[PDB]
Design a protein around this ligand. Structure first.
Ligand code: 49W
Length: 329
């Protein structure tokens, strides 16, 4: 009970959400807790789109601590786009709270149909300041600045479907979340939570690769040439003209990711990047791996990675701690 804990609810083993409150009356909202962006936004009661009809809305008039901003802002994600205006109000996360600058959202049409199809209301950013729109100091950083917490760090312990729940911890590291050694890796930039690791998949090896730890992505992305090289010759089959590959679950040819550094070694087994589809045959599965090319060769470590590894995000020390997550409690 020493640190701040936000319980994470698993969504069908593919996603996970975390709740937080806005306004001095604690208006509840379901958030995607995202280490891949650095902005917080909620749908407003002034929302004019159909999606907002199925979500929890933010009423500025009901909040004594609401401060009008009104600055128009248009958030562009990879998945879609939401638009609205800036507003300042009391943001409550767990047992902590602070006056914060967020985005009241009026238009969610650019975020459809993903928005309506999903159960979350908004997105909460957990990245660095330079990643944020409107130059907003990260919420944990500001929490340390206001001496609400001792250390400006937050840890992710992801849930497992029909097993145990998850936790986002602010203020410190809890021993119960991991077993084995906790190995830190320095950030190569104060932007994303990105670290440098050597990637190894069977014969394929890409050294000094840029790895981004992204909780807002439910897949592992890899350079396209890397993926192409690593898929042959596994008995995997490509969905017709869809960018997804499928195979039998008992496929022994399936390799293991090995991200190695001078500090530590982290691996990802087939059981972590395989999703289950049809129960026909002996288990049909989909590879949760996406080919993605950036100017700098980049691996994106999404939900699959973090579901294996308890992760620590340290603003003060500018680094990412990785430990094997404790199997049960
Ligand atoms: C509708 C969500 C889809 N979904 C679940 C499917 C049911 C995902 O797992 C998912 C979420 C996102 C996403 O927008 N992530 C952003 C945050 C976010 C999350 C959900 C919805 C909307 C926004 C950002 O945090 C992305 N993070 C960065 C910027 C690092 C990024 C950039 C490019 C590609 C992947 N990730 C991106 C992806 N992609 C994966 C491979 C190639 C392109 C995009 C997948």
């Amino acid at each position: 009970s020493s640190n701040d804990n936000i319980e994470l609810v698993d969504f069908q083993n593919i996603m996970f959400y975390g709740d937080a409150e806005v306004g001095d009356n604690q208006q509840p909202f379901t958030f995607i807790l995202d280490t891949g962006s650095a902005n917080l936004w909620v749908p407003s009661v002034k929302c004019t789109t159909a999606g907002c009809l199925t979500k929890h809305l933010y009423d500025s008039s009901k909040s004594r601590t609401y401060e009008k901003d009104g600055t128009k802002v248009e958030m562009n994600y990879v998945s879609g786009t939401v638009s609205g205006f800036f507003s300042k109000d009391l943001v409550t996360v767990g047992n902590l709270s602070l006056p914060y600058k967020f985005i009241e959202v009026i238009d969610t049409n650019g975020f459809e149909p993903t928005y309506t199809a999903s159960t979350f209301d908004g997105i909460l950013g957990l990245g660095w300041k330079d990643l944020s729109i409107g130059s907003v100091d990260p919420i944990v950083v500001e929490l340390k600045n206001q001496n609400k917490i001792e250390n400006a760090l937050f840890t992710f312990y992801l849930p497992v479907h029909d097993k145990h729940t998850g936790f986002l911890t602010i203020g410190g590291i809890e021993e119960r979340f991991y077993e084995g050694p906790l190995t830190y890796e320095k950030l190569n930039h104060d932007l994303y939570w990105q670290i440098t690791l050597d990637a190894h998949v069977g014969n394929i090896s890409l050294e000094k690769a840029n790895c981004i730890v992204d909780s807002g992505t439910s897949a592992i992305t890899v350079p396209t040439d890397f993926l192409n090289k690593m898929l042959q010759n596994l008995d995997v089959i490509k969905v017709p003209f869809l960018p997804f590959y499928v195979t039998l679950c008992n496929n022994s040819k399936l390799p293991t990711f090995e991200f190695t550094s001078e500090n530590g070694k982290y691996t990802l087994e087939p059981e972590y990047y395989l999703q289950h589809i049809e129960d026909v045959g002996p288990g049909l599965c989909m590879l949760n791996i996406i080919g993605l090319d950036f100017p700098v060769p980049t691996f994106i470590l999404g939900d699959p990675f973090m579901r294996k590894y308890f992760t620590v995000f340290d603003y003060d020390n500018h680094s990412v701690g990785i430990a094997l997550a404790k199997k049960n409690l």
